[PDB]
Each structure stands twice: as C-alpha cells, then as structure tokens.
Amino acid sequence: IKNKCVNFNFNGLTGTGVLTQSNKKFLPFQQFGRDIADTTDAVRDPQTLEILDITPCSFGGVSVITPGTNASNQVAVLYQDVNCSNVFQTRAGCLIGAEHVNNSYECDIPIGAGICASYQTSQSIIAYTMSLGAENSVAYSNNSIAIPTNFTISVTTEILPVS
Amino acid sequence: NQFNSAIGKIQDSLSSTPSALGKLQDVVNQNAQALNTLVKQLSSNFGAISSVLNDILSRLDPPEAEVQIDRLITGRLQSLQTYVTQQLIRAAEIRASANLAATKMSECVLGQSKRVDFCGKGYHLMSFPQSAPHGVVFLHVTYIPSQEKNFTTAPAICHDGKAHFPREGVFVSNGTHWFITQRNFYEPQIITTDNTFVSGNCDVVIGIVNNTVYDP
Amino acid sequence: MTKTSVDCTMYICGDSTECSNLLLQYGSFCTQLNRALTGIAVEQDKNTQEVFAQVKQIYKTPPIKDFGGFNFSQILPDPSKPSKRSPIEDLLFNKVTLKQYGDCLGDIAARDLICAQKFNGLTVLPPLLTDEMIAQYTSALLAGTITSGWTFGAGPALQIPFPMQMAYRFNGIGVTQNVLYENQKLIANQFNSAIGKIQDSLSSTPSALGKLQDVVNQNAQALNTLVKQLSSNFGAISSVLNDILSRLDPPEAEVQIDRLITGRLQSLQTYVTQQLIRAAEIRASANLAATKMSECVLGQSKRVDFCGKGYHLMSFPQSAPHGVVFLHVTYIP
Amino acid sequence: ISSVLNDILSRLDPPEAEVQIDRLITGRLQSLQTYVTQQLIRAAEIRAS
Numbered sequence: 001i002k003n004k005c006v007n008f009n010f011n012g013l014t015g016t017g018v019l020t021q022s023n024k025k026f027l028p029f030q031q032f033g034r035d036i037a038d039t040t041d042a043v044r045d046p047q048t049l050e051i052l053d054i055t056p057c058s059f060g061g062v063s064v065i066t067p068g069t070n071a072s073n074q075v076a077v078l079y080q081d082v083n084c085s086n087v088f089q090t091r092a093g094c095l096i097g098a099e100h101v102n103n104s105y106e107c108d109i110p111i112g113a114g115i116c117a118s119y120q121t122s123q124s125i126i127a128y129t130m131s132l133g134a135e136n137s138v139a140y141s142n143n144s145i146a147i148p149t150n151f152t153i154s155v156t157t158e159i160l161p162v163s
Numbered sequence: 164n165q166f167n168s169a170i171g172k173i174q175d176s177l178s179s180t181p182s183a184l185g186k187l188q189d190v191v192n193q194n195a196q197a198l199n200t201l202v203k204q205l206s207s208n209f210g211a212i213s214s215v216l217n218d219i220l221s222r223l224d225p226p227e228a229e230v231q232i233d234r235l236i237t238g239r240l241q242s243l244q245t246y247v248t249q250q251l252i253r254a255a256e257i258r259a260s261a262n263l264a265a266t267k268m269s270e271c272v273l274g275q276s277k278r279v280d281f282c283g284k285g286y287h288l289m290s291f292p293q294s295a296p297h298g299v300v301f302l303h304v305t306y307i308p309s310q311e312k313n314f315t316t317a318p319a320i321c322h323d324g325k326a327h328f329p330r331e332g333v334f335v336s337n338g339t340h341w342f343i344t345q346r347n348f349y350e351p352q353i354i355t356t357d358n359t360f361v362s363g364n365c366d367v368v369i370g371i372v373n374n375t376v377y378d379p
Numbered sequence: 380m381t382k383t384s385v386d387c388t389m390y391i392c393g394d395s396t397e398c399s400n401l402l403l404q405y406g407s408f409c410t411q412l413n414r415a416l417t418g419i420a421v422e423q424d425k426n427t428q429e430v431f432a433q434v435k436q437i438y439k440t441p442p443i444k445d446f447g448g449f450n451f452s453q454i455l456p457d458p459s460k461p462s463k464r465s466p467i468e469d470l471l472f473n474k475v476t477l478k479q480y481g482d483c484l485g486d487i488a489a490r491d492l493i494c495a496q497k498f499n500g501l502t503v504l505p506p507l508l509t510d511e512m513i514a515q516y517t518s519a520l521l522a523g524t525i526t527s528g529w530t531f532g533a534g535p536a537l538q539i540p541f542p543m544q545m546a547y548r549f550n551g552i553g554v555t556q557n558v559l560y561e562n563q564k565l566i567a568n569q570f571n572s573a574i575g576k577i578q579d580s581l582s583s584t585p586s587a588l589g590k591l592q593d594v595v596n597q598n599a600q601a602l603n604t605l606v607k608q609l610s611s612n613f614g615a616i617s618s619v620l621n622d623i624l625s626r627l628d629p630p631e632a633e634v635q636i637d638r639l640i641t642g643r644l645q646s647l648q649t650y651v652t653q654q655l656i657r658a659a660e661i662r663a664s665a666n667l668a669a670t671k672m673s674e675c676v677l678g679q680s681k682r683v684d685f686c687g688k689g690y691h692l693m694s695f696p697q698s699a700p701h702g703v704v705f706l707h708v709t710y711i712p
Numbered sequence: 713i714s715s716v717l718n719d720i721l722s723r724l725d726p727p728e729a730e731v732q733i734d735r736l737i738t739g740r741l742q743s744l745q746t747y748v749t750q751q752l753i754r755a756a757e758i759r760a761s
C-alpha cells in the first residue's frame with residue numbers, strides 16, 4: 001500500500017508511516033538507509049526489488065482561540081503550515097471559526113503577522129488587522145511657528161518590583 | 164487645584180481598577196506556583212515500580228531495594244537542581260529591576276532629571292515614592308503644554324546693517340508688529356537693545372527681515 | 380530573537396504507542412518546559428513594543444521637501460517601489476541573510492534541515508508586528524523629528540523650520556547660533572556628503588552587521604544541535620525505538636526506553652536553560668536600545684559618549700532584521 | 713559499587729563493568745554541566761558590572 005499512512009513490517013522492522021517512491025541507488029549489499037538522527041528512512045522491498053522512502057504522517061501546528069469558559073464555548077482553530085463556511089487565509093496559516101472584517105481596532109488576542117482576534121456582538125469571533133493608531137500630518141513651512149498658550153500638570157504612576 | 168485634582172483622580176483610578184498591580188501579583192504567583200509544582204512532583208516514579216518508599220521497603224529486601232531507592236534519589240535531586248536554577252535566573256532579573264529602581268530613586272526623587280521619558284512623560288517636575296508588597300510605586304508630576312497657536316517668524320532682523328539675533332527666545336509677528344518670546348509659554352515682548360546681539364552685516368542671513376529696535 | 384516551540388511527545392516518543400504511556404510518569408515535567416518557552420516568546424513581541432511604539436500617531440511627511448539645503452532623500456521612504464522602504468533600509472535588509480506537508484514530502488532528494496526539524500516537533504512562530512508596520516513606525520519617527528523636532532516627544536507636535544532647529548541645537552552644544560546662520564551652505568554640503576559616504580561605506584563592507592548574523596546563527600546552530608543529539612544512545616543497546624520494540628518483549632524494553640527518555644529529557648532541559656540565558660541578554664540589549672531611542676532621537680543628550688563620539692546634535696533610526704541602527708550626527712572641533 | 717575505575721576494571725569483566733561505568737559517566741557529565749551553568753550566570757553578572 002502506497003501514499004497512505006500505514007503500519008508496516010519489513011523483514012521484522014516494524015513502524016508507522018507513509019511510503020513513497022524515490023530515486024536512491026542502493027549497492028547490492030545494502031538493505032536499509034538511515035537519516036542523520038539514526039532513523040530508518042529508505043528500505044528495499046523483498047518482493048519487487050525497489051527503493052522506497054518512509055515519512056511520518058504527523059505534521060503541523062495547531063492553536064486554539066477561545067473567549068474563555070464563562071463567556072461562551074465557541075472556539076476558533078489556527079492551522080499553521082496549510083494553504084486553505086468561515087475560512088480565512090493569513091500568512092501565519094489558515095483560521096477556521098472566525099469572521100473576517102474590514103474595520104480596524106486594537107489587539108485583544110495576537111494571532112500572527114498583523115492579525116488580531118476578538119469576541120464581540122448575538123456574539124461572534126472576529127479576526128481583523130491591528131491598527132497602529134490614528135493618522136496625523138503637520139504642515140511644514142519656512143515661516144510658520146507654533147507656540148502653546150496653555151499647559152497642564154499630569155501625575156502618572158510607575159510600578160517596580162524590588163525583591 | 165490642578166495638582167490636587169490630579170492626585171485625587173489617581174487615587175480613584177487605582178481604587179476602581181483591580182488589574183493595575185499586575186507585576187507584584189505575578190511575582191507572588193510565580194513563587195507560589197513554583198513551590199506547589201515542587202511539592203506535587205513527588206508522585207512521579209522515575210522508572211521505579213512505585214513512588215512510595217514504604218511500599219518498596221515493605222515488599223522487598225534491602226539488596227533488591229537499593230536500586231529503586233537510587234532511581235528515586237536521582238530523580239528528586241534533578242528536580243531540586245532545576246528549581247534552584249530557575250530561582251537563580253529569577254533572582255538575576257529582580258536584581259536588575261532593583262538596580263533600576265535605586266537609580267530612579269536617586270535621580271527623580273532627590274533632584275530634577277533632564278533625561279527624556281525617564282521620570283514620566285513630559286517635562287519632569289518631581290516625583291514621590293510609595294511602598295508596596297515587594298515593590299515600589301513612583302508618582303511622577305510632569306508638565307505638558309497645549310492650546311497652540313500659529314505665528315509668523317524670521318531668523319534675524321535688519322537694523323541698518325547690524326543683524327540682530329535673539330539672546331533667548333524666538334522672533335514672532337502677528338501681522339503688523341514684531342516681538343521676541345520664550346519657546347514654550349506664549350508671552351510676547353517688545354524689542355530693545357537687550358534680548359538681542361549683533362554679529363555681521365545684513366547681506367548674508369537667508370531670511371532676515373527689515374524692522375527697528377526700540378533701544379533706549 | 381527567534382520564537383520557538385517544542386512538542387515533547389513527538390520529539391521523545393515519535394508516534395509510538397508503547398512510548399507516550401511510560402512518558403506519563405514524567406508528564407509534569409514537559410508542562411514546565413513549554414510554560415518556560417512561552418514566557419520567552421511573549422516577551423519578544425513585547426521588546427519590539429518599547430523600541431518602535433514610542434509615538435502614538437502616524438505622521439506623514441510633507442510633499443515639498445525643501446529643508447533649506449539639507450537633503451534627506453536617502454532616509455525618507457521612496458514611494459516608487461513596494462515595501463515603502465529607504466535605500467539605506469534596503470541595503471540593510473539585503474545584507475542580513477536568513478512549508479506545507481506536500482513541500483516536505485516532495486523535497487526528499489535534497490535533505491532540507493527545516494523539514495527535518497519540523498518532523499521532530501520543533502516549530503518557529505512568526506512575530507506579531509510585521510516589517511511594513513515597523514517601517515511605518517520609523518517613517519512616523521523621522522517625520523516628527525524633521526518637522527516638529529524634539530517637541531512631539533512631550534505633548535502635541537509643534538511645527539518649526541529646520542534651520543531654526545539646527546540653530547537651537549548648536550546653542551545647546553555650546554556655540555552661538557550666528558555661527559550656523561552665516562555658514563548654512565557649507566554645513567549643509569558637509570551633512571549631505573557625510574550621508575552619501577556613510578551609505579557607500581555600508582555598501583562596501585560585507586561583514587559589518589555582525590551581531591544580527593551572530594544571533595540568527597546561534598539560534599540555527601542550537602536547533603541543529605538539538606536535532607542531531609537524537610543519534611546518541613544513553614547506555615541503551617540502540618538509538619532507534621523501532622529496533623528495541625522489534626527485538627524485545629515489553630518487560631525488557633522498559634529499561635532501554637527509560638534510559639532514552641531520561642537522556643532526551645535532560646537534552647531538552649539544557650536547551651531551555653540556554654534559551655533562557657540568551658533571552659535575558661537580549662532583554663538587556665533591548666532595554667538599552669529603548670533608552671537610546673528615548674534620549675538620542677526624541678531629544679538631545681548631554682551624556683558623554685552616549686549618542687556618538689563628540690558633541691551630540693541628533694540621531695536617526697533605521698529598522699533591520701531583529702535589530703535597530705542609529706545614525707548619530709556629531710560636531711568636532 | 714565503587715568510585716574508582718581501577719577497582720571495577722580489576723574485579724569485573726567488560727559486560728558487567730559497563731553498567732557501573734555508564735553510571736559514573738552520567739554522574740560526572742551532570743557535575744560538569746552544573747559547573748558550566750553556574751559559570752554562565754556569574755559571567756552575566758560580571759558583564760553587567
């Protein structure tokens with residue numbers, strides 16, 4: 001069986017993985033070929049002499065976006081290293097269970113390359129692009145100065161651990 | 164009145180929002196969680212048949228039991244070593260934070276700092292210390308300008324050849340007259356032989372305008 | 380630095396059901412390891428916050444660009460290209476050098492290292508702030524520095540022409556403004572020539588950005604060493620789980636599997652400790668960089684030899700992969 | 713059974729001496745790693761100073 005993750009037993013060597021065809025050339029006195037971290041990757045076939053490669057069938061990265069237990073039980077899932085109802089494609093991987101919008105707000109739950117997620121109103125989970133802040137543009141010139149007329153006194157708190 | 168209102172509002176804001184003293188609470192939680200993990204890692208049997216000394220001592224003679232005891236001893240020594248290493252790293256981080264706090268106490272509290280964004284956002288005025296469990300809180304009192312206005316300016320002033328430069332402040336004009344003011348607070352003043360000094364001829368400054376100085 | 384994550388079950392057992400059952404007795408250890416690494420990663424995205432998020436509003440550069448005789452058409456972004464970068468930023472980005480299941484499945488003949496370390500439960504996470512947002516932050520900083528000066532760091536930004544700002548800065552360092560006002564063109568020419576020659580010097584030297592390359596090389600070498608340490612049998616009869624499970628009954632295989640488990644666990648612990656130490660060093664460096672941005676960019680500093688050799692005038696920030704570059708302008712008698 | 717390699721190599725054949733040798737190797741490697749870690753931390757403090 002090829003191109004399926006299977007349990008295999010080749011001449012007593014047992015394992016679990018996917019078989020495929022490669023172009024490795026084996027000398028007549030060789031039967032096995034192992035990787036750098038001593039993992040058997042190339043195996044001949046006793047019947048129908050040929051060289052095949054073994055690759056594990058578990059691969060990827062999964063993250064779970066949740067609003068918290070005492071808010072709701074709805075969950076979004078982020079699959080890295082994939083190219084995909086509600087499916088959104090980001091550079092950090094596919095996102096399932098969230099609705100894409102065009103507005104821009106602050107960040108609640110960081111997701112990846114400039115994408116943030118939040119739980120907002122019926123309620124839902126929304127993914128969007130984080131905003132760097134407002135936009136401003138002062139008018140430069142060579143004759144105009146700006147001088148303040150009033151002021152204010154501000155009090156701010158800073159907290160530092162000691163021991 | 165502004166200062167009193169500011170301190171009252173600071174007190175109210177601290178009272179209203181619990182999620183303010185995050186760092187000290189995080190430190191305490193980290194310590195407690197570390198000890199709790201150390202306590203509950205006793206249930207693991209690092210390859211031994213059981214995690215209880217009494218069972219091994221009750222079911223086996225000494226020459227068959229020292230092996231299990233040795234495995235447990237090695238595991239628990241490794242656990243203690245890991246705990247000590249993590250504590251050392253956290254101690255180093257806290258030492259750095261305490262050094263920063265000592266520097267801030269030396270500079271912002273015992274004087275006035277010229278550094279930007281060191282003792283608060285804005286032009287620093289003063290600071291006050293307050294104690295807290297395992298930490299300190301600095302109340303920074305600073306100055307912030309506002310309510311700006313546009314004016315017309317020129318670098319120097321031509322006064323029959325002796326170009327005049329402002330001794331301190333900026334030259335401004337509202338449309339008909341000319342004045343010299345200070346940079347931050349708007350307060351115009353007429354021009355005399357003071358506030359100015361002369362250097363060179365009025366044929367090299369790029370932007371010098373024609374006006375008169377009412378020198379007494 | 381790089382944000383990494385590790386999966387204990389894949390690294391130690393590797394999709395074996397005989398394993399991952401004896402591993403339960405050590406489970407309370409691995410929940411520690413990740414809870415350490417996560418603490419590193421969340422800190423990294425925080426570091427970039429104290430360096431580039433000093434300002435709150437994105438400023439836009441004026442379209443006239445006279446500025447007396449001064450010429451900034453190497454720091455300000457060039458609109459006639461993507462990524463909205465600067466030529467110096469382009470050179471810096473190019474100088475520093477740095478995959479779905481089908482990609483790693485088809486790329487067998489050439490043994491990629493990234494696929495090899497991804498098949499063993501080692502993953503790299505992307506940073507939160509992308510490069511374009513960093514460039515936007517830097518552009519806002521330059522615009523505020525050029526048009527408003529040092530004022531926008533404390534309160535609302537106030538407009539002021541550039542020669543007046545330079546006269547104020549000379550007055551700050553201890554020389555009368557009339558010196559600048561009567562020597563404008565020569566000073567502007569000196570500034571422009573200095574900028575040009577600094578760009579040329581950056582282009583000429585290949586081994587100039589040593590520190591950032593050192594950081595990326597350190598991370599890559601650490602991950603590769605962690606991958607290669609799987610070929611060592613810590614006193615067992617073999618380094619392959621399948622051979623042990625194929626030649627021995629469970630009661631005899633228990634000992635060998637336990638030995639392998641202990642060895643791989645201590646390897647992971649060593650890696651985590653090294654990462655923690657390096658993270659502390661990077662934290663110190665980032666704090667220094669944030670202070671330098673606060674004091675040399677948003678104002679003029681009086682500390683000796685802090686914002687460059689000689690009497691300080693101003694500084695300009697530039698982004699770079701995992702780092703920042705400061706251009707300091709100084710006065711020398 | 714002993715802290716001296718000579719005694720183990722004198723009283724036991726290789727197959728049985730291998731176990732004790734492995735135990736000693738692991739212990740001494742652990743000691744060296746602990747020393748290196750403490751040196752790294754002290755070096756960081758010295759660098760700050």
Ligand SMILES: *[C@@H]1O[C@H](CO)[C@@H](O[C@@H]2O[C@H](CO)[C@@H](O)[C@H](O)[C@H]2NC(C)=O)[C@H](O)[C@H]1NC(C)=O
Nearest residue numbers: 443444445446448449450451452453466571575
């Ligand atoms: C600022 O300097 C740049 C670089 O010298 C100037 O760009 C040059 O412009 C001339 C004429 O437009 C071209 O012949 C050069 O090839 C340009 N150089 C580069 C590197 O592109 C720019 O004009 C200057 N701007 C000001 C306002 O002085």
Ligand SMILES: *[C@@H]1O[C@H](CO)[C@@H](O)[C@H](O)[C@H]1NC(C)=O
Nearest residue numbers: 044045046047048049050051
């Ligand atoms: C082995 O025998 C089976 C009989 O079912 C046959 O199908 C297969 O082709 C044989 N293999 C070789 C290499 O002759």
Ligand SMILES: *[C@@H]1O[C@H](CO)[C@@H](O)[C@H](O)[C@H]1NC(C)=O
Nearest residue numbers: 088099100101102103126127
């Ligand atoms: C959001 O923007 C995209 C692209 O401009 C557009 O196709 C879509 O209709 C907009 N609205 C929603 C709800 O996605």
Ligand SMILES: *[C@@H]1O[C@H](CO)[C@@H](O)[C@H](O)[C@H]1NC(C)=O
Nearest residue numbers: 149150151152153165309310
């Ligand atoms: C300045 O502000 C104070 C309070 O904010 C106000 O009472 C006063 O009238 C203001 N004065 C000017 C000139 O704006």
Ligand SMILES: *[C@@H]1O[C@H](CO)[C@@H](O)[C@H](O)[C@H]1NC(C)=O
Nearest residue numbers: 139144146310311312313314
């Ligand atoms: C100063 O002039 C600019 C441009 O004309 C204008 O946008 C700004 O509002 C003016 N300032 C005030 C306080 O009116």
Ligand SMILES: *[C@@H]1O[C@H](CO)[C@@H](O)[C@H](O)[C@H]1NC(C)=O
Nearest residue numbers: 336337338339340341342351
């Ligand atoms: C400018 O200030 C002078 C000073 O008294 C005043 O007489 C004049 O009316 C002012 N002009 C305007 C347009 O405000």
Ligand SMILES: *[C@@H]1O[C@H](CO)[C@@H](O)[C@H](O)[C@H]1NC(C)=O
Nearest residue numbers: 141142143317369370371445
């Ligand atoms: C300000 O810039 C304009 C635009 O060219 C110019 O005409 C004017 O002369 C400049 N101001 C001075 C004082 O030179």
Ligand SMILES: *[C@@H]1O[C@H](CO)[C@@H](O)[C@H](O)[C@H]1NC(C)=O
Nearest residue numbers: 321323324365371372373374
């Ligand atoms: C200033 O006065 C001189 C001579 O009095 C004259 O040559 C010059 O044109 C005047 N400048 C302006 C702007 O009126």
